[PDB]
Design a protein around this nucleic acid. Structure first.
Ligand SMILES: [Mg+2]
Ligand SMILES: [Mg+2]
Ligand SMILES: [Mg+2]
Ligand SMILES: [Mg+2]
Ligand SMILES: [Mg+2]
Ligand SMILES: [Mg+2]
Ligand SMILES: [Mg+2]
Ligand SMILES: [Mg+2]
Ligand SMILES: [Mg+2]
Ligand SMILES: [Mg+2]
Ligand SMILES: [Mg+2]
Ligand SMILES: [Mg+2]
Ligand SMILES: [Mg+2]
Lengths: 184, 258, 223, 142
RNA sequence: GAAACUGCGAAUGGCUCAUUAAAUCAGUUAUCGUUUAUUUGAUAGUUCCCUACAUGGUAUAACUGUGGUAAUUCUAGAGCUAAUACAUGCUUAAAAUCUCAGAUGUAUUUAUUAGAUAAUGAUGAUUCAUAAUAACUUUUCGAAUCGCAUGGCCUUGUGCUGGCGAUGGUUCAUUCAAAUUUCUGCCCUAUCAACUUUCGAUGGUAGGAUAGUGGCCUACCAUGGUUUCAACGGGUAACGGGGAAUAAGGGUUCGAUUCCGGAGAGGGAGCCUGAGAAACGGCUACCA
RNA sequence: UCUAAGGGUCGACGAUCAACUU
């Protein structure tokens, strides 16, 4: 099958390496998961040492962390809007590490209203204890109006079976907004 | 080569076993266990080649399967169990306890010890690490993990192991002026006192040892075993106390029996 | 052509020789589990509904359940399938098996009688074979003999008398999953081991915490 | 480094979170480490803006193997250099030596400024490319 | 105690030297870049939205009986029955801390936090060990297993306890290993001086894949990388080394072959099981 | 059905305008 050996892949001098040692199992590669969106389908892969990997095909929901208040809500992934490695992954909505996706933002809005009671997207004194340090950002808060939060996938769906990630903020959010309004 | 090997060809066995060249094609391959393969001594070798109690592997197995032999308080009916340094081999029938120590020639000497000393053993601290739930532990030379060690116990120290409960009664700290056993290299089996420790950060720690004859030799930190203080070992030393006589004086001592 | 016909109820089976194509065309074009009638195949059978289940053709190749072909093909067979026994863990072999559709190729068909229409056959009800072995698991015996849960099933397990040297000693099965004081003792020992280990860990942790506090206080008193 | 964010992906040190809720002082919280073996972390690594996950001070690589010295002969790759390591090989039959050299491709952090010449000290790291197994740790620009 | 199911082994050994010239191999490094059945040591009071004095067949083998084929370690149909097989599923403290009664074991995935210090562990070094917070999971584990001894208390009952072991099991460590890996070192040849780079060549970023690093593969980007200190190509009747012969000294020639390392099982490729095989006294295909 | 690269004008960026070739 796919091999990760360096016996092919001709040397740094450019010489073609003569073949010995017919392909070894401990150097195998495998096919990409090419994770899609919707109707969760996880296939287990028996890996080296008897361990298990999880090829996530057609992932529906993921765990996404706000990381500004430490919430990490489970939410639905709407689609892929940007991928630094390949525009084809955006076109085909391929779920993959470092892919910029859009998430439902409803669980985060609900948590924010139950935490601060500060009309984010439109026993008693806990909200008052949560003081004027309750504004999040003028660029994160504006996404709640459309009910879709920009996030980056941080897990590896083809490796772990999960599509976890974090909501974009600050300079990272500014950079990805620049790219998105440039190419769209 | 497709998997772990299970045979040990003769002339590939450790030399300190002193196995015959032409007895067979194979040597006893030590099983996986506490110490090592090359730094170990299989129970079959100890019983048939050092004590001559058994005459072949069949008799070694017959001795083992009646629960006679016992390593560190446990029966160890395995023919090729890897007994190693500081291990106590007790025979209850013909009650006698041996401590696997190196003679000055680098072989595992046959070293009788009393029961009050076979009660315990020494172990060199291989590592000190926090385990799960934040429980610190020490890993010794023979693969023991002891939870909740004294917070002053560091790597290269020595711990006295109760060998009945498997707990630490005392610990000797590595520093200059302490008695050390050499457990590998050219100076294997020699006993002396730490003089100095060269660091060589990133490389290999070196340590200078001075024996009772004021001879000084250098060796890596990996094969020095603290065994107490100067002149007061925590274990009973073997017949020669690791003095490393030259060939000339060895011949003189041999001929001194006329 | 041969017909390996079996009556599962109380156990029976026998082989018929049906050599008339006019009376055997009924089995053709039917693959598995179809309403082939005894009155449709032969005059001996009246009102019989046959479960048409498997067979062998000339050259002896067995029929496979879901091939859906009138001919035979080579399949890469695996562990948990018919027509192949793996001689080694993970072994797979490409063996030629015959399709599920019945046709003129078959040398023997295998039928299961599922409904009784008329006068009994000479190998259907007159001859019956008893179940060779009774139940072994305790709850299995309880279900087989209909008793309740707290009924102490230790006596009426099906037995057998072997008459070899006029001793006739009974042979009852060692029944499994029995509620036994040995098993209860094992469970009690496991629970006691868990609780003892937990207590030992807790007291070791407490003593280590005492040691740490002592050393810290000594350091702060030494300044 | 001249619009550091020059890649398609956002460049940042992993798990180094600049909290936008807190109004911190530096506002560009940067992770750095002491590479060890007496190698000083350069002020460029301390106070720079580059990311270089392969940097021995601000990246995820470590120096744990051989420490070699070489003369830089190529600075034409991006963040990678080739050093020429001249040595004498002994031919016993003639009781003499012969000049030999070996090229070693070495990753160079943006913390260092390297030109042809510029004898550098490199430390072994894990494989970070097909041919690179060393990282510059001392520049010694002479 | 046959057979059979289950477990383990069959990846060791043995053979040969065809390929292989920076490849293997030798010495020396590294894993702060990973997997590791087994052994040894340690390690698991947390499992629920009307069984635990112990669940199911959703199961069947062996066995009984009926057969097919000329022929295979081919097997079909039907009737039974077990598990340390398969699939399920409770009982085991008190307290504390959070959240607004619930949660807090462990495993997984992500994000965040602590991991300090010239006047709260380790390393030369880390985003290490470990702990904490919020969640996550086609739920991982948290013995419904076996032998021998039978004991103590006692409401004398299917009472409550209780020993020595075997097997199984999460994690860490150890051991046996494995996989990559640093530096230096291979015979002849220029009637081989340029080679590699569209089709990865050298490097960067991101991803995929891997047990994991890595152009190992992919996308985008840059134009790199080797070489008269012999690259690249060609030859080897070349497996490398320990060593062998001959040897004043220096050398010369040999090393298929008792040990170590590699490779292969007619030639290739692919793959199942498994901790470990690209296995061949394993399978699949093609060629002969 | 898309993606990418290749421009003019005006004020290391922004506004506006535009045609084809790969
Ligand atoms: Mg072999
Ligand atoms: Mg960590
Ligand atoms: Mg990468
Ligand atoms: Mg040769
Ligand atoms: Mg050859
Ligand atoms: Mg040879
Ligand atoms: Mg030959
Ligand atoms: Mg060999
Ligand atoms: Mg092979
Ligand atoms: Mg042949
Ligand atoms: Mg093969
Ligand atoms: Mg053969
Ligand atoms: Mg073989």
């Amino acid at each position: 099958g796919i091999s990760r050996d360096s016996r092919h892949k001709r040397s740094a001098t450019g010489a073609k390496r003569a073949q010995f040692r017919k392909k070894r199992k401990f150097e195998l590669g495998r096919q990409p998961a090419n994770t899609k969106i919707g109707a969760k389908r996880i296939h287990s892969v028996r890996t080296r040492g008897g361990n298990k990997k999880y090829r996530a095909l057609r992932i529906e929901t993921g765990n996404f962390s706000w990381a500004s208040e430490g919430i990490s809500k489970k939410t639905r992934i709407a689609g892929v809007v940007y991928h630094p490695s390949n525009n084809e992954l955006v076109r085909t909505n391929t779920l993959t590490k470092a892919a910029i996706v859009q998430i439902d933002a409803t669980p985060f809005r609900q948590w924010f209203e139950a935490h601060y009671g500060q009309t984010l997207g439109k026993a008693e004194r806990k909200w008052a204890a949560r003081a004027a340090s309750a504004k999040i950002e003028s660029s994160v808060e504006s996404q709640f109006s459309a009910g879709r939060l920009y996030a980056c996938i941080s897990s590896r769906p083809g490796q772990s079976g999960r599509c976890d990630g974090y909501i974009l903020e600050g300079e990272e959010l500014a950079f990805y907004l620049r790219r998105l309004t440039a190419k769209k | 080569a497709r998997g772990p090997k299970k045979h040990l060809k003769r002339l590939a066995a450790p030399h300190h076993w002193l196995l015959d060249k032409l007895s067979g094609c194979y040597a006893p391959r030590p099983s996986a266990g506490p110490h090592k393969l090359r730094e170990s001594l299989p129970l079959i070798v100890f019983l048939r080649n050092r004590l001559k109690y058994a005459l072949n592997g069949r008799e070694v197995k017959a001795i083992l399967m009646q629960r006679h032999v016992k390593v560190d308080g446990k029966v160890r009916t395995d023919t090729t169990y890897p007994a190693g340094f500081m291990d106590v081999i007790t025979l209850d029938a013909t009650n006698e306890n041996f401590r696997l120590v190196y003679d000055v020639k680098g072989r595992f000497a046959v070293h009788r010890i009393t029961d009050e000393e076979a009660s315990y053993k020494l172990g060199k601290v291989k590592k000190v690490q926090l385990g799960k739930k934040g429980v610190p532990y020490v890993v010794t030379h023979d693969g023991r993990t002891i939870r909740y060690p004294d917070p002053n116990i560091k790597v290269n120290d020595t711990v006295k192991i109760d060998l009945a409960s498997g707990k630490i009664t005392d610990f000797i700290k590595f520093d200059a002026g302490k008695l050390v056993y050499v457990t590998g290299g050219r100076n294997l089996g020699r006993i002396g006192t730490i003089v100095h420790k060269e660091r060589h950060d990133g490389g290999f720690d070196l340590v200078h040892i001075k024996d009772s004859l004021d001879n000084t030799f250098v060796t890596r930190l990996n094969n020095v075993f603290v065994i107490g203080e100067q002149g007061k070992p925590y274990i009973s030393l073997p017949k020669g106390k690791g003095i490393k006589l030259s060939i000339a004086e060895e011949r003189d001592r041999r001929r001194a029996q006329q | 052509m041969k017909l390996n016909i079996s009556y599962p109820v109380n156990g029976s089976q026998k082989t018929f020789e049906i050599d008339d194509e006019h009376r055997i065309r009924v089995f053709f074009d039917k693959r598995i589990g179809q309403e082939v009638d005894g009155e449709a195949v032969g005059d001996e059978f009246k009102g019989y509904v046959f479960k048409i289940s498997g067979g062998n053709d000339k050259q002896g190749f067995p029929m496979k359940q879901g091939v859906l072909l009138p001919t035979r093909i080579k399949l890469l067979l695996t562990k948990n399938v018919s027509c192949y026994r793996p001689r080694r863990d993970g072994e797979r072999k490409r063996k030629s098996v015959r399709g599920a559709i019945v046709g003129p190729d078959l040398a023997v068909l295998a039928l299961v009688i599922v409904k009784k229409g008329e006068q009994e056959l000479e190998g259907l009800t007159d001859t019956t074979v008893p179940k060779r072995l009774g139940p072994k698991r305790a709850n299995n015996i309880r279900k087989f003999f209909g008793l309740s849960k707290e009924d102490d099933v230790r006596d009426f397990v099906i037995r057998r008398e072997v008459t070899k040297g006029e001793k006739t000693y009974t042979k009852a099965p060692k029944i499994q999953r029995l509620v036994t004081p040995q098993r209860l003792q094992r469970k009690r020992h496991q629970r006691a081991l868990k609780v003892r280990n937990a207590q030992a860990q807790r007291e070791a942790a407490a003593e280590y915490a005492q040691l740490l506090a002592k050393r810290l206080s000594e350091r702060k008193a030494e300044k | 480094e001249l619009t550091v964010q020059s890649e398609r992906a956002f460049q940042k040190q992993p798990h180094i979170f600049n909290n936008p809720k807190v109004k911190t002082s530096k506002r560009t919280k940067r992770w750095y480490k002491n590479a060890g073996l007496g190698f000083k972390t350069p002020k460029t690594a301390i106070e720079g803006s580059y990311i270089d996950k392969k940097c021995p001070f601000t990246g995820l690589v470590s120096i744990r193997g051989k420490i070699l010295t070489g003369t830089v002969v190529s600075t034409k790759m991006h963040r990678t250099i080739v050093i020429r390591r001249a040595y004498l090989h002994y031919i016993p039959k003639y009781n003499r030596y012969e000049k030999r050299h070996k090229n070693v491709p070495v990753h160079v952090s943006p913390a260092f400024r390297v030109q042809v010449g510029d004898i550098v000290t490199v430390g072994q790291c894990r494989p970070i490319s097909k041919t690179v197994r060393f990282n510059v740790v001392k520049v010694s620009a002479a």
